[PDB]
Symmetry: C5
Subunit: 346 residues, 5 copies
């Protein structure tokens, strides 16, 4: 017989197969085994708190109404246009904001029925999945994106999802991200839902993303530190050259301001304080204080010999005090942002 | 009987069920009970005056044409492909700008018919809902987004919507927003429409959003205040050092200008005046006035002893007068923007 | 009879109703009465020269093939899935760039057939409509957006559109725009098309939009004016302090430049000259000329007593001449842009 | 007979009309006459090298299988839902990147069959058409956008396209563009394709666009020229005032830099050199050279009377030499960009 | 016979053709020959790591069930609406993120059946294909975009893809890119997939893109070099003029900062270090070090004849040492970025 006419006999009207009735309709629940292959991963966006993925989803279950022994071939293949003639699980992605299937050329779907009634069902689809991001430690933040597979209308006494044991989630080689770095280790969890209706099956996977810091180091942190160092050279300039020390102080404040305002187009638009904002505020307070120090030296120095040496003492104290307090701030900043804040205990 | 063939008998041609006729067609109106579960909430945009939501919508009503007692099961389940065989309310979202259903895997829909004829109908859908925003008190503004559920073509003697009594609107845990903060308290109101055609049912929910201020404090308000303070140190510099006091005055004006123009890429594009614009204008008038004060001191001081002390008196008066009037402005600014303007009386 | 089976008798095959034949097929033209209710209005974009609207469109006409007297109910309701069984006008929006209907929940459509054969047809739809904008007087410009309703394939001896007499165009309360302000008065016009094929019916509505000026006043015009005033204080500084007057002149030019370049991210991207560009160019010519005045004073003053007083005379003349010519420019600018240019004569 | 039942007799099963067979199937090719009416024109984008159009497309040909004489009416009208019952040319736009039809209200389509068998077929559609743009002479560039109408699967012995003789391409009145200006003169060409399969018909139209220069003149070219002029006033300042001439030179370089970097957000993002980039680089080399001239004057002047006058001679030579070489550069720049480069020889 | 009725006899129910069974169902695999014609190429985006293409795809294979000799014509043409009546390969693009067909006018598809049973199948489609980009050598980077054609559900003993021998991949003339330059040479490779299911056929093509450097040379590298040169003229200024050398040093640092921050809006947003970032950091370290040199000269020079000449020696050494070390840096920079890094060995 042609492999198709055998399918029309297996899921036939004379056979009485009903695609709206689950396998083992009265007995134990259906056990669906799931795989994910991630083809692409990106478009991670803080404005919408989501990311975009392109996956192969494979589901495997057993349907005893589809067992056959008379046909010699040990596997049959359903046409993708006849997919509504067979029962399929009602899997949906719980944190999905948008999805579509792929129909370029032939529909990107595949269904294979085995001799014992096992069904293999593999589809290709694009997802936009939501992920809440924190950003409090922004240059040095670690994010966790999840992906939850849930049944829409079957409780856990009719339908149960499980991950594959060998490789349930795989990622294609050679994927890059402009901002993040996808780690190799992934969690497979149960996130079983308890509602008023009953207990609904749900499995999830967690991906860990670490932001790279090299660009922010070379473009924001180090230029701000050089501007802070440049504000300290006023303390070695002679206190009589007021146009020199005042113009150096205020141009250092202006350079600090153009550095902040120019860095303001390439940062995430949030409303709370980030760690780079703390750094940029302390560097501005440092260049503001170096100009107030000269305002005090210039005012104390003109009160007409005891007054000349008190003003020179303010300069010699500021020569050691400004770099020391800036080293203490750097120690507490990098310690509390690279040791005292790790959120991957999972 | 298979649960499906029983459905084909209940809504059968021999039964004479008509999906275009409401339940209790001659008698009292249909009472629909509604729930909302908000899965995601975001994309709040001032350019388009809208926000994006992803919800579960559940409707419950009674259809006496669907009551059955012969079948043992106390609940039946309609296939999502047979949903046009049953009557459903014509609910629409009155402030919707765009919407779609979810068909990833199986259609994200569910209909359950009980023994007494009660119908439970649960769908998943994405909305873009309009919300007019004010922005007059922008760093410190509070917004209210609503969501109106209305019948399209039935008056209130045929169809009535009501919220559930226990939990009509719930929000998923762990949702974050980049700019706002969704409050926990929600209003459930009637917004019944009165038209020429008659009285149309309509229920709504109000969400309250408060903008976070910490980033605007650390990046806009405090640097402007430091620049204003830096403009006051001219009054303690000797009045003979004209290149020092003129260059400090005009570089303080330039720093104020680069601070404003750099803050100009991360603010909402509206055409009216915001509170941050008031603050930025007053700080510019303060650094403009400190340079006019030196122009007066420098001009009065050269008129050739009575003229030297009048110019020194302008400096000693400005030393107390500029910080005092700036403290008075700060008191009236933060009082009228954090006490005299609350719009959540609802 | 069930209200549906009566519809299947009225537009029946035995009745011989043909949905492809207009009412009064041989006689006088069909008269369609139109209403518009505007739910939302926004997304006004100069880059694409269009705006976005969300309306209810209601059409009313008479079909004598649909008159019935045997049924007791004085109004019937066609199902939105049976809308291709009835004749409808082929209304299209002549300046539409994009459109779609709304199918969230049930299709957002409604058709009501009365006893005398009158049809009421109400649909909800989203439009993107084109509008050419001028922008020559940009901070102070007034725009006119139109909306044209035309028949696609019927001449004015078959189909005629008319506005309702009581309220053909209404707008929902509480709509805001980020940049514009929609006026209350609307024009209802005929814009009848004359083609080679014949005379085609077409009605239109005009909306008037006025841009708000308060933000541009507080952020662009007033800071530029303060910078121009700051360039005049060089004339009161002693002519011997060349580092003071040269540094004040060139830093005033730099402040004028950072003010222009920072305002350059929030303006519409056109290729012709706007009124704000005229203002920004004249303020730059004013701060350029104040520095050329000192270059002349400094050069004339050193030619070695007659030369000292000629240079002092240039300063005393510039003290009155620069503010006077700037007041004359302000008078001609605001007069020709707020009196001599009104384009709402309509 | 009803005009429809006559259509069902003309294209009937008893008539044996086949919509998959072209008219004159064995004989001479079909001659299709084409018109274009452009409703809107815009969204010209250098990032994607495309533009957007909204047109009416009208095709006219003769089908002798559709000739009829028994019916009194000299024109019939096919319903837009029955359009697959008739043969139509397989016209496609060869440089299209995206297209869609308009289905707001009734489908925006129209087909009219005459007595002699002539068919008039008019549709409304939106196109995104590709256009390669050059941008080497960017402020002063002229672009040419084309629009090619080709048959997909018929060689020129089956199907031939021709433009109408009276008005094949018309544009609606009152269209504006933010950046360009659409000229009135249009080319109608043949662009016949020669492939391995055979000779395929193809007609095209060329539109000419000229960029407006007024905004770039008032905002980029003239401020740069004023900054260059301001760098020349150092040559008239006394050579002993080193803080004045050094601060004026470096602040002029900084003003030139903020002028360039602020103009950097409103220019097209390409990777090759534009004419404005040439202008901005030469103006920077001019303000760089004026500061090197003072570095030479200041160094030569202190070598301890012969040295004082050699340094004064460098100043007096630079007073005439810098404006002269800048006038020569302006003459060669505007001559080679407004005379020696015209690309509309077509 | 009409060419259609012959098709209905060839793929007839009496013929028993089954479109779900491949040709040579029991025997050797089907050999499909593929061509690509690229109509447009662009939208290369680093944020999403993808590019957009518009191609003609042509597939050729042999179907012995479609051989016919009775008909005189040596080629038949299937209607695009009957394409599901014939077997077609299940080609899909393995790195596709989005795709669609073109249905403007008639569907842009074509199928031709020859006498011996050869099938030619040509479709037009738009692709968004993923490409990982590196950007470590960003101004001077070379990218490689691929395009993989794979069978979805057939192993290599049923279906085999091959490129054409004469011209499998062609590109239309006159395509331009805003940033890149598409090379003429293309690789044709096998990328055969080995899975658990078996061996799946897959062919690919590689395109090579080189970024143009002229704009980055004239706008970023050369202005930074002029600012570095301007920082060296302090060494030729007299060491007693402290306001001149301090103001020149700090204004050179500020100019370097506005140059970097203004270049910060037109660069790709990645998180790692690019070569332009290395260049911009070294130029900032050079202008920072020239100001530290004067801070040392000014401090050493005032310690009260031995001290005057040690400070003059620091100036005379810095006059030769700063340009030399900057020439060494330029030599190592351009050598390691234009010789030691070529990645087109392929
Ligand atoms: C799906 O898997 C579950 C769990 O593995 C199966 O439930 C078990 O079935 C065995 C039958 O041998 C019982 O002994 C266990 O007590 C069951 N466990 C639970 C928790 O119910 C279930 O039978 C499987 N379904 C099918 C159709 O095979
Ligand atoms: C829907 O709810 C309304 C209001 O609860 C019901 O209307 C009431 O019906 C009771 C019947 O016992 C009357 O006594 C009341 O006077 C009615 N109130 C009003 C305001 O009409 C209505 O019957 C319900 N519909 C159905 C189908 O049960
Ligand atoms: C549609 O309206 C037009 C104009 O009101 C009607 O045309 C008029 O019909 C009356 C019939 O009493 C004539 O006396 C007028 O001379 C007509 N005017 C014109 C300009 O033709 C038309 O009859 C209406 N159509 C229908 C179906 O009622
Ligand atoms: C379509 O137009 C072409 C060209 O005008 C016609 O081809 C000509 O037909 C006339 C018949 O009187 C011949 O004398 C010419 O020699 C033909 N020219 C060419 C170049 O073939 C063609 O007949 C037209 N098609 C139809 C159906 O009328
Ligand atoms: C498709 O091409 C393959 C390879 O060219 C063909 O396989 C060969 O068939 C010949 C038959 O003459 C054998 O001699 C070779 O040994 C085969 N090679 C391999 C690697 O199998 C195959 O026959 C072709 N398919 C069809 C339908 O013609």
């Amino acid at each position: 017989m042609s492999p198709s006419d055998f399918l029309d006999k297996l899921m036939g009207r004379t056979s009485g197969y009903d695609a709206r009735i689950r396998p083992n309709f009265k007995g134990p629940p259906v056990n669906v085994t799931c795989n994910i292959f991630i083809n692409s991963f990106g478009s991670i966006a803080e404005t919408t708190m989501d990311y975009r993925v392109n996956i192969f989803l494979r589901q495997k279950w057993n349907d005893p109404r589809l067992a056959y022994s008379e046909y010699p071939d040990d596997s049959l293949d359903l046409d993708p246009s006849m997919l509504d003639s067979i029962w399929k699980p009602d899997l949906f992605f719980a944190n999905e904001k948008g999805a579509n299937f792929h129909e370029v050329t032939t529909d990107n779907k595949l269904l294979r029925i085995f001799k014992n009634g096992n069904v293999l069902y593999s589809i290709r689809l694009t997802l936009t999945l939501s992920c809440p991001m924190d950003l409090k430690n922004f240059p040095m933040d670690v994010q966790t994106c999840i992906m939850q597979l849930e049944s829409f209308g079957y409780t856990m006494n009719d339908l149960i999802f499980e991950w594959q044991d060998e490789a349930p989630v795989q990622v294609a080689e050679g994927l890059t991200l402009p901002q993040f770095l996808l780690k190799e280790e992934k969690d497979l969890r149960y996130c079983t839902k308890h509602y008023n209706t009953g207990k609904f099956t749900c499995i999830e996977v967690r991906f860990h993303l670490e932001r790279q810091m090299g660009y922010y180091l070379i473009q924001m942190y180090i230029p701000s530190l050089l501007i802070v160092i440049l504000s300290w050279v006023s303390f070695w300039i002679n206190m009589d050259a007021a146009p020199a020390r005042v113009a150096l102080g205020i141009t250092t404040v202006l350079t600090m301001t153009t550095q902040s305002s120019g860095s303001r187009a390439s940062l995430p638009k949030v409303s709370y304080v980030k760690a780079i904002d703390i750094w940029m505020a302390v560097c501005l307070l440092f260049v503001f204080s170096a100009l107030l120090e000269y305002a005090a030296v210039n005012f104390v120095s003109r009160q007409h010999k005891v007054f000349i040496d008190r003003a020179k003492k303010i300069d010699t104290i500021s020569r050691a005090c400004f770099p020391l307090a800036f080293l203490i701030f750097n120690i507490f900043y990098w310690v509390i942002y690279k040791i005292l804040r790790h959120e991957d205990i999972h």
